[PDB]
Design a protein around this motif. Sequence first.
Motif, short mmCIF file in Angstrom:
data_model
loop_
_atom_site.label_atom_id
_atom_site.label_comp_id
_atom_site.label_asym_id
_atom_site.label_seq_id
_atom_site.Cartn_x
_atom_site.Cartn_y
_atom_site.Cartn_z
N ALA C 19 0.58 -1.12 -0.13
CA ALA C 19 -0.09 0.11 0.03
C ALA C 19 0.72 1.34 0.12
O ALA C 19 0.49 2.26 -0.62
CB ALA C 19 -0.87 -0.01 1.08
N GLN C 20 1.85 1.23 0.77
CA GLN C 20 2.83 2.46 0.75
C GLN C 20 3.50 2.43 -0.74
O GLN C 20 3.64 3.81 -1.09
CB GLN C 20 3.94 2.20 2.02
N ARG C 21 3.88 1.35 -1.28
CA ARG C 21 4.55 1.52 -2.52
C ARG C 21 3.52 2.12 -3.53
O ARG C 21 3.83 2.83 -4.39
CB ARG C 21 5.08 0.17 -2.90
N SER C 22 2.35 1.62 -3.31
CA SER C 22 1.14 2.14 -4.37
C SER C 22 0.99 3.78 -3.98
O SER C 22 0.76 4.48 -4.96
CB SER C 22 0.02 1.45 -4.44
N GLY C 23 0.97 4.14 -2.88
CA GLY C 23 0.85 5.55 -2.75
C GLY C 23 2.01 6.30 -3.04
O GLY C 23 1.96 7.56 -3.65
N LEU C 24 3.14 5.73 -2.77
CA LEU C 24 4.48 6.65 -3.61
C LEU C 24 4.29 6.70 -4.74
O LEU C 24 4.86 7.66 -5.49
CB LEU C 24 5.68 5.78 -2.79
N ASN C 25 3.98 5.55 -5.67
CA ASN C 25 3.76 5.64 -7.19
C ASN C 25 2.85 6.65 -7.44
O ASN C 25 2.85 7.21 -8.64
CB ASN C 25 3.62 4.23 -7.74
N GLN C 26 1.61 6.62 -6.63
CA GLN C 26 0.46 7.53 -7.03
C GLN C 26 0.87 9.11 -6.70
O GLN C 26 0.12 10.03 -7.02
CB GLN C 26 -0.86 7.16 -6.59
N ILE C 27 2.06 9.23 -5.88
CA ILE C 27 2.48 10.61 -5.56
C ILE C 27 2.75 11.69 -6.63
O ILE C 27 2.48 12.79 -6.88
CB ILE C 27 3.27 10.46 -4.59
N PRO C 28 3.38 11.02 -7.82
CA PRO C 28 3.71 11.85 -8.95
C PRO C 28 2.37 12.34 -9.68
O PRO C 28 2.63 13.24 -10.54
CB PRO C 28 4.64 11.14 -9.78
CG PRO C 28 5.34 10.14 -8.97
CD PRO C 28 4.34 9.78 -7.65
N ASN C 29 1.39 11.45 -9.74
CA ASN C 29 0.14 11.86 -10.13
C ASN C 29 -0.41 13.11 -9.45
O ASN C 29 -0.95 14.05 -10.29
CB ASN C 29 -0.95 10.64 -10.06
N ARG C 30 -0.05 13.21 -8.31
CA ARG C 30 -0.63 14.44 -7.67
C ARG C 30 0.02 15.69 -8.17
O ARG C 30 -0.34 16.84 -8.25
CB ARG C 30 -0.50 14.49 -6.22
N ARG C 31 1.42 15.35 -8.16
CA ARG C 31 2.30 16.77 -8.71
C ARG C 31 2.04 17.12 -9.95
O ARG C 31 1.92 18.38 -10.50
CB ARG C 31 3.87 16.09 -8.40
N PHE C 32 1.72 15.81 -10.97
CA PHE C 32 1.44 16.39 -12.34
C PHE C 32 0.05 17.19 -12.35
O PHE C 32 -0.22 17.95 -13.18
CB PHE C 32 1.35 14.90 -12.92
N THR C 33 -0.81 16.72 -11.64
CA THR C 33 -2.29 17.40 -11.55
C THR C 33 -1.78 18.69 -11.12
O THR C 33 -2.70 19.55 -11.63
CB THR C 33 -3.03 16.79 -10.46
N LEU C 34 -1.19 18.90 -9.99
CA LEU C 34 -0.94 20.42 -9.50
C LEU C 34 -0.43 21.27 -10.42
O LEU C 34 -0.48 22.42 -10.61
CB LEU C 34 -0.08 20.22 -8.08
N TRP C 35 0.61 20.63 -11.11
CA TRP C 35 1.39 21.39 -12.28
C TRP C 35 0.34 22.08 -13.27
O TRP C 35 0.47 23.15 -13.85
CB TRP C 35 2.32 20.82 -12.96
N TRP C 36 -0.62 20.96 -13.72
CA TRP C 36 -1.36 21.66 -14.85
C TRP C 36 -2.80 21.98 -14.26
O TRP C 36 -4.05 21.74 -14.81
CB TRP C 36 -1.68 20.59 -16.00
N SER C 37 -2.95 22.23 -12.89
CA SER C 37 -3.97 22.45 -12.14
C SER C 37 -4.75 23.82 -12.92
O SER C 37 -6.14 23.65 -12.90
CB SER C 37 -3.99 22.75 -10.77
N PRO C 38 -4.34 24.79 -12.86
CA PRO C 38 -5.03 25.90 -13.73
C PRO C 38 -5.78 25.67 -14.79
O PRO C 38 -6.96 26.04 -15.05
CB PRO C 38 -3.95 27.09 -13.85
CG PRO C 38 -2.86 26.76 -12.67
CD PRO C 38 -2.93 25.21 -12.79
N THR C 39 -5.29 24.93 -15.80
CA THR C 39 -5.69 24.42 -17.17
C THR C 39 -6.96 23.59 -16.61
O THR C 39 -7.97 23.16 -17.72
CB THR C 39 -4.85 23.91 -17.94
N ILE C 40 -6.91 22.66 -15.62
CA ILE C 40 -8.02 21.77 -15.36
C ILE C 40 -9.07 22.33 -14.30
O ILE C 40 -10.09 21.54 -14.22
CB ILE C 40 -7.27 20.35 -14.82
N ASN C 41 -8.64 23.19 -13.53
CA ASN C 41 -9.45 23.59 -12.40
C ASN C 41 -10.53 24.90 -12.99
O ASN C 41 -11.42 25.16 -12.12
CB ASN C 41 -8.76 24.14 -11.26
N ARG C 42 -10.52 25.18 -14.39
CA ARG C 42 -11.36 26.02 -14.50
C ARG C 42 -12.83 25.49 -14.68
O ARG C 42 -13.06 24.22 -14.93
CB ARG C 42 -11.12 26.30 -16.22
#
Lengths: 211, 75, 55, 141, 53, 55, 213
Positions: C19-42
């Motif tokens: 479970a910790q490994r899956s969370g760590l692997n999904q952590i970059p997804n949060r960063r990618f979402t944050l980077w392109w957040s303004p284009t997606i939060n509209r």
Amino acid sequence: KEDMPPEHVRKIIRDHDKRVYLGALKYMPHAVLKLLENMPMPWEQIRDVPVLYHITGAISFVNEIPWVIEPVYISQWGSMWIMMRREKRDRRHFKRMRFPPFDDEEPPLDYADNILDVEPLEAIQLELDPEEDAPVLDWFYDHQPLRDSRKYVNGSTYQRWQFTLPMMSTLYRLANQLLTDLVDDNYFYLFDLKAFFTSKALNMAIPGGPK
Amino acid sequence: VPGLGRGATGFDLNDTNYDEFNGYAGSLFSSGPYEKDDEEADAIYAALDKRMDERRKERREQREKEEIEKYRMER
Amino acid sequence: WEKASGFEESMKWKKLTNAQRSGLNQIPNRRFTLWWSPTINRANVYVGFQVQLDL
Amino acid sequence: SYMLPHLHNGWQVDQAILSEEDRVVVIRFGHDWDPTCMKMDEVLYSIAEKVKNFAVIYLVDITEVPDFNKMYELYDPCTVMFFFRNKHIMIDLGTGNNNKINWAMEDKQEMVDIIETVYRGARKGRGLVVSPKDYSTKYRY
Amino acid sequence: DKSKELHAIKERYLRKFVFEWDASEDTSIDYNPLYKERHQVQLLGRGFIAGID
Amino acid sequence: TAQCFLRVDDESMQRFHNRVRQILMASGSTTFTKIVNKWNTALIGLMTYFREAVV
Amino acid sequence: SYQKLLKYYVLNALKHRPPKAQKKRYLFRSFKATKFFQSTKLDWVEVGLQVCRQGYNMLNLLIHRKNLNYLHLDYNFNLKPVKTLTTKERKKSRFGNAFHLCREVLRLTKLVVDSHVQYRLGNVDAFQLADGLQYIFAHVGQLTGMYRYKYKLMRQIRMCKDLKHLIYYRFNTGPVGKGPGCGFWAAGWRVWLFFMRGITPLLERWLGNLLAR
């Protein structure tokens, strides 16, 4: 098992261990279907009918069946169509009800009070000229046209409708508007039931027919 | 003792007892309130239903029995 | 940009569970979402479900 | 089968929730007749001897003890709920609520991971444990 | 028409409660003129269709 | 003297569709970047192998 | 509309399985033989009003004996919840598709009976009554709202719409142009009578199962 006047049933309805009422309530859709079937025709103003008033009073079913002579019904329908066309082309200021009745939450109107007193308005009965409507003058309009004419009809059961040739001629004249006035069935070539079945079975489509 | 003793709270209307057709299962009339008049009314209603269900009952029953016997070969 | 280097090693030099490994692997997804957040939060990108972050 | 002993009495189930405190208590409110509860019981049997050292799973029949399905409102055919030391932990599945699993989880590894995460969250005291899964979708393609 | 006739010859050689049936599902779009504009059933100058005025 | 009309064999297209379906299904907890890289690799292989026939 | 009517006719013709040999048992005559039923004769309007009242009473019994006193059935047979309810009461407020279909059928029957009463109460003319019946049969899926209760009825609704289109486009010709005076309602009446006759066994079985023991 002699019958009883409808006044007793009406009084019971206005007046009425929940065993008997609950047990016999299982047949309401049959009563609804009977009521739908036994609705009055446009040619009739008031259509008295026999019903089966339950002892509990949960459901009353119209025991009668709507058996009508085919040519008489066709003539009535044609006369109704002619009268409707005339009224529409004349009374252009037509205000259809086109709305649900006023009883959104109002109590149901007592048929004894607000329905058994007022004389109803004249129905849609096309005028009958005795020059050509004489053989069917009296037989044209009735709840059951030949419910008593032994010579013309079988009797009360209304199982046979054998009329004279002039009577049928007058019926056809009074109903020729709704009849297609065809002679040879050849005019429906490649448009009959067999043609439609062959088209459907062959995955084809007759242009004038379905698919 | 109820479940309140465990100190737990939230976060026959079961989904299995419920269905799309005919709604939920069970009878809206409790089987408790019966009587001898209830027995007579139920007997009359059941007799009427059985009489009105005997039109094709014999042929249908025979055909269903034959079908069950046939299905016993593969089921 | 720190490629897979936001944390120390995202606990990769360890013996954590799956479970910790899956969370760590999904952590970059949060960063990618944050980077392109303004284009997606509209509000013109998703349906109207306006929700304001607390305080 | 159903090697997990179902707590027939409701008060017995409640006492069982109060029995163990140092592990995870999971109660399967599904009725044993339905095939979905059969699959849930099979999944539990897969993790019967694995999460045993960290959890204590019990079955339940909503017909036997109805108070659980009427107070907690477990209307699903087979709903999996958790209770840790008189505290019903919530799994952040993302299905609108978090009281039950409500899905016939046919993956033993997923159930084991969910149990481990629930135990970790209960140890951390978080009443709403973040489930390491995207349960909001069907997770199929 | 003509191009449609040639294409038809070549071809022969080789939820939502919709209330009103849409006109897309209709038939009787015939390329040929003989099967599109056909002489009506004139009943020897003494009859006609039913219902119409 | 002739014209050798070419087109991707249906077996190759079936293999590509199966690979895409597997990548989408076996994505799981993998980051969006990993899925994008896998899709890019598959598309690059498909386009570089059937350079002309892909049109 | 003509093509759809032809399709319905061809479907009813190709599936014309000859009827089976019944034992000829009359349910109406059986109920007449039962001592728990009386016999009389009354006008169709009075009988329709009595049937509407009986159906309203039956719906009230079905929505009151189940301890679901958080909803009310209107005199137009449109049941509306009284107030908000919990998820337990929401499941208690579960109305089966059979119940919804029965409610819609009862609402249509009550509307027809009340229209007949208004025709017999001097509220509107007989031609107006025919127009009202034509409206209460054709283009009545919106009024009845029975499509959601049973999706299969949408075929009957489309057939009624096609019959209305044909009757309109035939009658409304010449001096009589477009208007509300079309009172030719036999076709829609026949279609809805057939639909009711088909629906009756299912609803009757549901109602009988509901009242057991």
